[PDB]
């Protein structure tokens, strides 16, 4: 009988000061707010119901109204920032945090969920949840000998909320909050549930999304090898964030990048660089480009793992965004590599697919490619083989393309294309 009430009926029941009447009206609100299509969130807010729901959260003597109000508030907080704000403005944060201590699992779970929605709004509400002291009691819920004893849905909700507490930038989460949460994240990273693993990998992705100091906090926990293992998972929803985290780490120092290599990450790239999921191939190629921007010994590891042919492959055929990352990978390679490494690159067949991409109308990739060709020519100069190279480029139709780029709209483009022709083609 709590199905399809009007907001007016709900207000009447909640204002009755009959606890049972209040419970029934709150449940009716929960059901209204639970419908997928246009729940009357703003109407509930305007009716002034939020403070009432928040008050009901504190009714330890009536667990059902605690649960119903927690659920109702959760769904209001799942809306726009303004709707989440109305929940926060009603004093919900400390009330939900107190509910984390409820002896009723379904109730503490609902509080976890609601706090996830609030923190998920952005860095301000995230940090406000942290300031109210949510982390300790959240982490306490996970303090058991074996995660497997927790209900699956329960652990998934907790993991997700924790990941939202690691989420967002400007600013990033407080350093001490991150240190507090990390050890639990590391443990979750070793759990066997696919959804827990996915969200945990996303959490690590957020945390490594910043300057080297932020990256270092994660790497020093020793999680890199586990992330590399997760790179090989069959579940693509695990691979995506695992690879994002790994990619974030190699944007750091040479030493942080080396940890990724030492952990054996490169052995997985033959598969990642040919992955049928476009976005995985893209971030795999992005990751490669940051590794080829590393030291010569790190470029050499790329060579040893046979990944150059895979980069030629991606450059030859892939989604355009991926090809652009491949272009960057090649320019970095040619920029930081030895003459021998550059010779090897050309021998792998890089030239033709490079020239073919000059046909694209993205001004940046053209710049990247022209820079790569200059780098390769510099290497040929040291070998006095600049003539072999010029012939290579002309035979696959590169000369024709480079010549036309002399007339290019863009500044740096027609310039550099001019230096090339003037310098090695006349």
């Amino acid at each position: 009988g709590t199905v399809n009430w009007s907001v007016e009926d709900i207000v009447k029941g909640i204002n009755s000061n009959n606890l049972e009447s209040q419970l029934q009206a709150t449940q009716a609100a929960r059901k209204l707010l639970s419908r997928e299509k246009q729940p009357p969130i703003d109407n509930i807010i305007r009716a002034g119901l939020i403070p009432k729901f928040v008050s009901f959260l504190g009714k330890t003597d009536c667990s059902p109204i605690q649960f119903e109000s927690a659920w109702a508030l959760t769904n209001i907080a799942s809306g726009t920032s303004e709707q989440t704000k109305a929940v926060v403005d009603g004093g919900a944060i400390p009330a939900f945090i107190s509910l984390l201590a409820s002896p009723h699992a379904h109730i503490s779970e609902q509080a976890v969920w609601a706090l996830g929605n609030i923190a998920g709004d952005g860095s301000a509400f995230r940090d406000l949840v942290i300031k109210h002291g949510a982390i300790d009691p959240l982490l306490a819920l996970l303090a058991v000998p074996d995660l497997s004893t927790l209900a699956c849905g329960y652990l998934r909700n907790l993991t997700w909320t924790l990941s939202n507490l690691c989420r967002n930038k400007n600013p990033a989460p407080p350093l001490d909050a991150v240190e507090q949460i990390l050890p639990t994240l590391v443990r979750l990273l070793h759990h066997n549930d696919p959804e827990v693993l996915a969200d945990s990998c996303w959490a690590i992705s957020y945390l490594t999304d910043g300057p080297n100091e932020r990256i270092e906090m994660v790497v020093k926990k020793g999680v890199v090898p586990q992330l590399v293992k997760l790179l090989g998972a069959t579940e693509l929803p695990i691979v995506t964030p695992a690879l994002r985290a790994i990619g974030n780490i190699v944007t750091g120092t040479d030493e942080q990048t080396q940890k990724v290599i030492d952990a054996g990450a490169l052995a997985v790239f033959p598969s990642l660089l040919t992955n049928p999921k476009t976005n995985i191939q893209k971030e795999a190629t992005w990751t490669m480009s940051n590794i080829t921007a590393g030291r010569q010994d790190q470029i050499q590891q790329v060579v040893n793992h046979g990944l150059v042919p895979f980069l030629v492959g991606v450059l030859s055929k892939a989604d355009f965004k991926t090809q652009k990352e491949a272009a960057w990978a090649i320019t970095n390679y040619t920029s930081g590599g030895t003459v021998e490494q550059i010779v090897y690159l050309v021998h792998c067949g890089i030239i033709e697919p490079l020239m073919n991409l000059l046909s694209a109308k993205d001004t940046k990739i053209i710049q990247v490619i022209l820079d790569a060709i200059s780098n390769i020519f510099q290497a040929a100069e040291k070998l006095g083989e600049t003539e072999k190279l010029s012939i290579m480029i002309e035979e696959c139709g590169g000369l024709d393309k480079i010549e036309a780029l002399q007339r290019h709209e863009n500044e740096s483009v027609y310039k550099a294309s001019l230096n090339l022709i003037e310098k090695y083609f006349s």
Binding site: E36, W113, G120, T251, E283, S289, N332
Partner: peptide
């Protein structure tokens, strides 16, 4: 050579907020 960031495809990420349906 510089190290570079990569755009974040939001549709790949966990939801920021979740409505409980049942």
């Amino acid at each position: 050579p510089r190290k570079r960031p990569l755009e974040w495809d939001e549709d790949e990420e966990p939801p920021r907020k979740r409505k409980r349906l049942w």
